[PDB]
Structures are given as C-alpha cells and as structure tokens.
Amino acid sequence: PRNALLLLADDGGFESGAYNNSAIATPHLDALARRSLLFRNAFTSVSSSSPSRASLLTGLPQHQNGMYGLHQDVHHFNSFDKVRSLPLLLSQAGVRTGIIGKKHVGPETVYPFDFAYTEENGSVLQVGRNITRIKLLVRKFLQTQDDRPFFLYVAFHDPHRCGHSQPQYGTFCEKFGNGESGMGRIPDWTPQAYDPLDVLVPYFVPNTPAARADLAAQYTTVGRMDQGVGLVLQELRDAGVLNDTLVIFTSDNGIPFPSGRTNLYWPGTAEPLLVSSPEHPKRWGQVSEAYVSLLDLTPTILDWFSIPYPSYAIFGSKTIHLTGRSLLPALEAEPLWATVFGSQSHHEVTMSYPMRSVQHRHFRLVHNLNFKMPFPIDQDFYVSPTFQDLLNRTTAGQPTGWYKDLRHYYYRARWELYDRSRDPHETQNLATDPRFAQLLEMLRDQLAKWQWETHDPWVCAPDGVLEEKLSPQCQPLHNELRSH
Amino acid sequence: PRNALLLLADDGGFESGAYNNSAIATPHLDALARRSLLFRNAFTSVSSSSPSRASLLTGLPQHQNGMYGLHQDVHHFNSFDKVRSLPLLLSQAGVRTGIIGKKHVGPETVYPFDFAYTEENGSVLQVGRNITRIKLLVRKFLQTQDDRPFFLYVAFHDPHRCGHSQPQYGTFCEKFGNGESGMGRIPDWTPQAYDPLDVLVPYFVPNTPAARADLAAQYTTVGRMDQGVGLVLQELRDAGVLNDTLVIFTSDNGIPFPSGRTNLYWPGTAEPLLVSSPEHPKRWGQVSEAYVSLLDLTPTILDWFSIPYPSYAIFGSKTIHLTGRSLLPALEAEPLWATVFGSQSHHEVTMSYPMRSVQHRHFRLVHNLNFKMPFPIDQDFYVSPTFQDLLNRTTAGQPTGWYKDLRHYYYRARWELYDRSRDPHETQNLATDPRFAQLLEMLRDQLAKWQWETHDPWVCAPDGVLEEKLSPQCQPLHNEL
Ligand SMILES: *[C@@H]1O[C@H](CO)[C@@H](O[C@@H]2O[C@H](CO)[C@@H](O)[C@H](O)[C@H]2NC(C)=O)[C@H](O)[C@H]1NC(C)=O
Ligand SMILES: *[C@@H]1O[C@H](CO)[C@@H](O[C@@H]2O[C@H](CO)[C@@H](O)[C@H](O)[C@H]2NC(C)=O)[C@H](O)[C@H]1NC(C)=O
Ligand SMILES: *[C@@H]1O[C@H](CO)[C@@H](O[C@@H]2O[C@H](CO)[C@@H](O)[C@H](O)[C@H]2NC(C)=O)[C@H](O)[C@H]1NC(C)=O
Ligand SMILES: *[C@@H]1O[C@H](CO)[C@@H](O[C@@H]2O[C@H](CO)[C@@H](O)[C@H](O)[C@H]2NC(C)=O)[C@H](O)[C@H]1NC(C)=O
Ligand SMILES: *[C@@H]1O[C@H](CO)[C@@H](O[C@@H]2O[C@H](CO)[C@@H](O)[C@H](O)[C@H]2NC(C)=O)[C@H](O)[C@H]1NC(C)=O
Ligand SMILES: *[C@@H]1O[C@H](CO)[C@@H](O)[C@H](O)[C@H]1NC(C)=O
Ligand SMILES: *[C@@H]1O[C@H](CO)[C@@H](O)[C@H](O)[C@H]1NC(C)=O
Ligand SMILES: [Ca+2]
Ligand SMILES: [Ca+2]
Ligand SMILES: [Cl-]
C-alpha cells in the first residue's frame, strides 16, 4: 500500500544546507534532499497561515475556498461547508488520515482527521515544537495502523515566532526545552547556538544588531525543526513503511520579517519544497527549475493515491476544478512550467489589503487592490525586535540599514511589475515603463483569467462592481481609479 | 401570559403618515402608532442587513458579536459560537420563539427558533413579501400555542429592492402578486399605485425622473408591507392575545438610496420605531424625543420577560455586558437619553470600509478608517435606476439634481463632524474647524470608550496596532495617519 507524509514548517524559509546556506546546520533536511527532488521555484499562493494551509489542503486559492484570513478567535474565518478538502477525499477513498501540530483551519467537517493532536485538543507548544512529543505521537500513529494506507500531516509550529505570546522562551522559542532553568527539556533535541555575526542576512532584512539577533534565534529553532524531521522519518523507518511512503516537505509562507510574511513579494511567497518518491528515485538529489505552487500539493497527493477530484459545486452550478497539477511527472523528467499565481485578502480581520499576483518565470506582477491605504502590520510582527528596531530608527530619522523605507512599504503603487533576473530585490517597478506595456497587458490577462476561473469575488475590485448577469460583468464605478 | 412581537421592515424608512408623510397611505402603521409610543430619534448601530439583524438580536455591535458583514454565500459572516442571542435566552427561559421571513444571520446554534419559516427552509419571496402566506403562518403559530409565553419575529423582506435579483417584479417587487400576467395574486393585498410626481423626494435622493420612479415603486411596496402589519396584528387580535403582547415595529437600516443604506450618515442609520405596551398605555399616540438604538431592543424584550442577561465571556475572561438599555421606562415617562453609537466594518466581503460613529443629540461624528480609498458600492444598489441615473449624468458632465457629487461621496474625510440642527443635510464638516476642537475631543473620547467597552478589534486602526499587554494599548505605525 502507498502512503504519504506531509511535513510543513511554519514561516519557514531557505535556511538549510540543501538550499546552499552554509551558516546553518540542517543535516536531516539535507539528508532528505539527497533522497528528494528539490524545487528552486516553489511558491505559496498566499502569505498568511490559515489561508495558506486551507489552500494547501484544498488545492483552491483562499478567495475560492473561503479562508479569506486567519481562523482563530476574533478573526474567525472558515472555509465553505461544501468544500472538499484533501483529507476528506482521502478518508472517503479509504485512507487513514492523521494530523500532528498546528491546524489553524476549519471547519472540522471540511478538514476532518481520523487521528488528530492539534491546538484544538492540546498545546500547540507541545505538539508543534516539542519534537519528542511529536516523535512519540508519530510512533503511536504507525503502531495503530490497520492495513489501510495512511496520510500523515505533521505541521510543525517551528520556526514560528514566540515574542508576542511567550517571550520567556525567546523571540523564536529557541530556549524552550533547552535544559536551562524554567525552560524544561526535550530529550531528543540538541540545541544549536548561533552567533548573530555568522547568520546570513537576507536582502530584505535590515542589517542591524536587533535583526541579526532575531536571525540567530531563528537558526537555533530551525535546527530543532530539522531534528524533528529526522525523528519523524526515523519512526517510519522503524515501522518499515518509509520505502512505501511519499514524503513532502515545505513551508506555509515566507519568513516573519519585513517584505516577508503577509506580502506577495518574492520573500513572502517563495518556499522550500522537497519531494521524495520511493518509486521514482531517478531524480533523487537533483534540483528542478520548474515554477510550482502549493496549489499543486493536493493534486499531487491525490494522484499518488489514484484518487480523482470529484465533480461538484460550492455555490449554484459553478463546478469546481483545480488549477494546480500533480508534481509527480517532474520526478521523472524536467518540465517547462513557468506560471504561478497569488491571492490574498485578509490576514487579521482588521487587515484588509487584498493583493493578487501572477508570475511568469522571473517576471512578477502584483496588484494591490486597496493601494491608497497603508499596508497593515500584524500584532505579532509589530513587537518583533526587527520591526521595532526599524520603526525606531525610522522615527528618529536615522539610517535603517534596510533596502526600503517604511513610507514606500506602506504606500505602494496599484500595479507592481518586477523582473527578478535584473532586479531580484524587486525595487524597480516597470509597470509605468512603456517598454513593458505589452508584457503588462499579457500578465494582467493571465491574472484576470485565473481570477474568473477560480471565482474570485474581488475580480472587479477596486475600480468596478461585479454584475454576473450582464456584460461586461465588471461594471465601472468611476471612482477615480483606472479599469481594465 | 406575556408575549412579544417584533415587526421588522427591510430597508424601511419614514414613508408613513405616522411620521408625517402625507404623500403615502399607511393606515395600519398609523393605527399602530396610535397604540404606541413613536420614537423620532431611533437609530441602528450598523447600516447593513446581516450585521444589523445580528446586533438587534444580540444587543451587541457587529464588531463584538462577529457578524462583520453579510451572512450569505460568498460573504459567509457568522456570529461567534459563544454569543448568547435574545432568542436563545428567551428559549432557555421557557419562552416559545418563532421567526417568519428573512433571517440572514447565523449560525443556527446562536440564533435558534422553535418555529421557523425563513429563506433557509423556503422562499424569501413567499415568507417575506407574500403577506397572505405570512398571515397564515402567524395564524398557525398562534393556533399551536401552549400555555407558554411567546416571542414572534416577523421579518418582512419588503420594502427591499428586487432590481438585481428579480427585475420582472419591478424595482421594489411592487408588481409581485399584483394580479397581472406572471405576477401571481396575493388575495389579502390591495395594490396602491403612486404618481412619481407626488412622492416626497428625501433631501439625500437626487430629484430626477428615474429616482422618482424608484420612489413611486417603493411607496407601492411599503403599502404591501403596511397591509402585512395589519394582517399580523389582526391574527393576534383573533387569537385574543394582542392585549397581552408587546409590539415593536422598526427597520434594520436606512433606505436603499444614495447616502442611505451602507452609510453611517443620518439617512443610513435613522430608523422608524414604534413601541406598544398593553400595560403602559399612558403614552400611546405620543412622540418621544429620546435618542435610542436598536441595541436597546434585546435589553427591552429581556426586561419585558424579566430575564436577566447572564454573566459570560466569548473569549478569555473578558465578560460581556450590554451597552443598550430597556426602553420600557420611556413608555411611562420621557427620559433624557441623548447618545447613540454606530459601528460598521464590511458589507459585502469585498467592501471593506470600516466606519465608527457617535451621536450626541444633533451632533454626529463619523470616523472613516479606510478613508483614502473610495467608498464601495454594493452590487444590488449599483443597478438601481437611481444610481445608474446618477452615474450616467455624472459621467456625461450634466447636472445630477443631487445635494452631493460622486467625487465627494467616494472620497471622504477621515473625520466627519456635523451639527444637524444647523446642517441637517450633513454637508458642512466641522472636524477641521478649531471652534469645535474641544467638542471633537469629547466625542472622540465617548466613541473610543465605547469601542474599548465593546471589545472592538478595530479600536486602534488605522493609525495604530492593538497590543493589549502594552501601554498605550494602541501602538503607533507612523503610517502618515
Ligand atoms: C548550490 O550551489 C551549487 C554549486 O554552485 C549549485 O550547483 C550548480 O547548479 C548550477 C546549475 O544551474 C551550475 O552551477 C552547476 O551545474 C551546478 N554545480 C554543481 C557542482 O552541482 C546548486 O544549484 C545550488 N543548490 C541550490 C539548491 O540552489
Ligand atoms: C516534551 O515532551 C516529552 C514527552 O511528551 C516530555 O517528557 C515527559 O515529561 C513528563 C512530565 O513532564 C514525564 O512524566 C515523562 O516521563 C516524560 N516522557 C518522556 C518520553 O520523556 C517533556 O517534558 C516535554 N518537554 C517540555 C520542555 O515540555
Ligand atoms: C523499496 O522500494 C523500491 C521501489 O518500489 C523497490 O525497488 C523496486 O523493486 C521492484 C521489485 O520488487 C523492481 O521491479 C523495481 O524495478 C524497483 N524499483 C525501483 C525504483 O528501484 C525496492 O525493492 C524497495 N525495497 C528496498 C529495500 O529498497
Ligand atoms: C408632525 O407634524 C406636527 C405638526 O408640525 C409636529 O408637531 C409639532 O411638533 C413640534 C416639535 O415637537 C412642536 O413644537 C409643535 O407644537 C407641534 N405642533 C403640532 C400642531 O402638534 C409633529 O411633531 C410631527 N410628527 C412627527 C412624528 O414628526
Ligand atoms: C388589557 O390589558 C390591560 C393590562 O394588562 C388590562 O388592564 C389591567 O387590568 C389589571 C387587572 O385586570 C389591572 O391590575 C391593571 O391596573 C390594568 N392596567 C391598565 C393599564 O389599565 C385590561 O383589563 C386588558 N383588557 C382586557 C379587555 O382584558
Ligand atoms: C524603541 O524605542 C523605545 C522607546 O524609546 C525603547 O524603549 C525600545 O527599547 C526601542 N526598541 C528597539 C527594538 O529599538
Ligand atoms: C445609462 O446609460 C446607458 C448607456 O447609455 C443606458 O443604456 C442606460 O439606460 C442609462 N441608465 C439610466 C438609468 O438612465
Ligand atoms: Ca505560517
Ligand atoms: Ca436591510
Ligand atoms: Cl467562534
């Protein structure tokens, strides 16, 4: 019987030897990468936890599945009842499903799991960061197997920040379980300290002491996550099912720094992705240049279990189809896929800054629907040392060491067009350059077509109103905003 | 045994003889007004259907109960599970609950009804506009009563527009059931035609042929709603329970015209309100000047049944308390209440234009949190003849006959302060006038206090971020605001 394992890092980036970061040690991820096809050009469709996890587990963009923003307490976003998620479809096909760690999506009927240990019935600290607890839960899952195939979803909470919720464990909870007084112990974890002067400062992160300290703490926590991956894989090896299991590792969104999480800039949507098939080792240890999306995961896993996507509608007769594709074929031969999309509406319920993006190879186009208002900052990131430092220096009128300034971070153009082959930092907007008018129109057309195809309620915003029963379906408001 | 009846109009305004409109005939509402206390200064806290209905049925502002916007299909907003609504509390106290018409709120567990005929299990056209069907459902409700008190919620869908959904019935569905071909027949309804030249054109509605036609159609439909009220009251009278029943009539938000629905301007939140207590007829046929809110209805009805609001929390240990008050005391003697609040976030999910308001007597202060972006227009109103006409004339550069222009309707000041005793049209913003700096700060303080008191997640927006463990709790973003 075929099995599947989805390892999901929380706010994880490219901090690994597998992705050529020699400043950090991630031997277990590196080991996995040698048995995997590594993707250099993978992206999430949305840079917000719940929406990203909902899209990943449905194959549908947030504006289609209904997770327009964060799921918990006051934010309270849920996917539509009639949505058919991966786990649901797997269960109906006779596959045993399990989740360990951060779920952060609902409702339960849409995202059901036979075996569940999450924040809903326990501590996300334990089942998300305590890799020993995680390892034992994986062991229990495998011991209680019953001849059915399985799908195991391990959603680490590492390397997510902790500064807002639990500061006593460090900015990235890098102190939790380290053995020191009040921290407790995680027997299977060997803490890895990092010097702030040795960490790699990403181009979009301010080069300041405060930021480097943040990164050092992050590195330590990523190491814990790395060791967690090692333990999990070892449990399958001990149960004798690893060689029958498709393993996938990735992250839900960009790292929690400026221009990262919550942005549709490269840093906010670019994600690590490893795919290891025991049946297709031809391209083990290789790197793929194909442009892929987390919207491809549901299709990939369905393909793995030979389960077809059913024909159904959420509203009316509007039949639902996936825009992603199975990545399995890439495990045999390199494809030429070059296009990926992005869609984000809310993060927190108070943060309404819808963005839509399309990327064709190195060209990225972002549409900021509420561009005239300032880009909103979430409550957790606001208190990060990195942002506090940036805010402090900006307010004092002193050099920030940042590749942008807050003014331009807050107030953006409606359309942002970048060529990352020339301008990887995405600082040279080409949208108003007449030499790129034809390319702009092409990308706009591709984006709009995808929006209609995926029933985006925001498809006419902000210059127009959606009127389905007439033509054109987007009717103009004449609100001093251009239309297309 | 005491009963209560809540009659709720959808997008209803002051089109009635009771409110001194001589151009329309509303004999049944006028009759009700003679047996009730009429409120000249009643307001909804939010000018959007689901949020308004959730707030009305909970006593909590939309930003607290969780209905941030519309409830249906793609908009998909629901109140928090732990919210304790009026109907829930009544049920737990042994009161039989019933709803007939448009519900437009959820989830069911939060808003449960023993007897329910709504859009969720039938046609909103029938149970919302077909007053004969409504009358028979009321009859059925009363015939199946036991020795329990009852609370009956009749949510008319009239006089809501129909232009977007069902244009064949007219702009306001004023043709539905009129007898003509394809319209069907409503035996208990006597259609009332109106000349577009005779209707009263509200100050905030463009004086154009297209708008007057809209109003004429509205008047006809309001008449149907009026006759529906008559039938309902008559059913209680036939069951011999009217004299044991507290009757309340009002509307969920302002009329569907410019500056009305979806706005926190006077036209968008001002609502008609009649309260008839068979035990306190002292002030029957009188007019009250007290400033009241639909947030007062839940407290009022709870008071009527002698049911206390329980002590509980939705999140954490932050206990929930109502900011509204029972209106019952006003039925005996005129009070001095002068303050009312407003809070609106979304309408449609794609319409994010949060507004917060406070009104002290004739002074109204509105805060537009997303002011730099244009005011969004909903899909239903966009295709209205009134707006289409306005848009058309504006685009052609011709006179609109409107007291505003679209540019200023779309792009508003962050703070709008109006004195309606001098400027009822609300066109002279005083917020930037130094003469009103002290008053401005006072109203801002009242507004903010209410926001914190009601756990508003938008309390720091847009210039700051909420950090509860820090001081001040609103931390600055320095985002040019
Ligand atoms: C890490 O760096 C190595 C060495 O520079 C990269 O391997 C090279 O990849 C490119 C092909 O696009 C060429 O420089 C050579 O064909 C490769 N050289 C070797 C020695 O393998 C590799 O691509 C990088 N790894 C990742 C994940 O980006
Ligand atoms: C991580 O989880 C492990 C196992 O779930 C915890 O170790 C257990 O701790 C309990 C009480 O704290 C002991 O009674 C058990 O004997 C331990 N079991 C094992 C297998 O070690 C550990 O406390 C957790 N670490 C932290 C920092 O919370
Ligand atoms: C692990 O899985 C692989 C793939 O299924 C097994 O290798 C296959 O073995 C079969 C015979 O049983 C051959 O016909 C195939 O050609 C093999 N495929 C590949 C890709 O090598 C392997 O035997 C399994 N067991 C171990 C210990 O690796
Ligand atoms: C309908 O119109 C009448 C007459 O204008 C209003 O009654 C007047 O109210 C004002 C202000 O309260 C008093 O100063 C006058 O003495 C009243 N005149 C009369 C003849 O009664 C009445 O308030 C209006 N009704 C409504 C509901 O607005
Ligand atoms: C209608 O209801 C009122 C009030 O419930 C009745 O009048 C009350 O009668 C009770 C006892 O019969 C007295 O204690 C109250 O003082 C009365 N209230 C008032 C305001 O008069 C009245 O009898 C009822 N009418 C009918 C026909 O039954
Ligand atoms: C920012 O400034 C505040 C107040 O001046 C200070 O207390 C804090 O330490 C500073 N934080 C950072 C990260 O620089
Ligand atoms: C607005 O203009 C369009 C196109 O000229 C026209 O067809 C339509 O009838 C106009 N709408 C109104 C309400 O006059
Ligand atoms: Ca995340
Ligand atoms: Ca309404
Ligand atoms: Cl909830």
Numbering used by the authors:
A (entry chain A): 22 to 505
B (entry chain B): 22 to 502
How do the authors describe this structure?
Mucopolysaccharidosis type IIIA (MPS IIIA) is caused by the functional defect of N-sulfoglucosamine sulfohydrolase (SGSH; also known as sulfamidase, sulfamate sulfohydrolase and heparan N-sulfatase; EC 3.10.1.1) and represents one of the most frequent lysosomal storage diseases worldwide. SGSH belongs to the sulfatase family and catalyses the cleavage of N-linked sulfate groups from the GAGs heparan sulfate and heparin.
Two crystal forms of glycosylated SGSH were grown at different pH values. Since the SGSH structure was determined in two crystal forms, S and L, we could use the ten crystallographically independent monomers of SGSH to assess the structural flexibility of the enzyme under two different crystallization conditions.
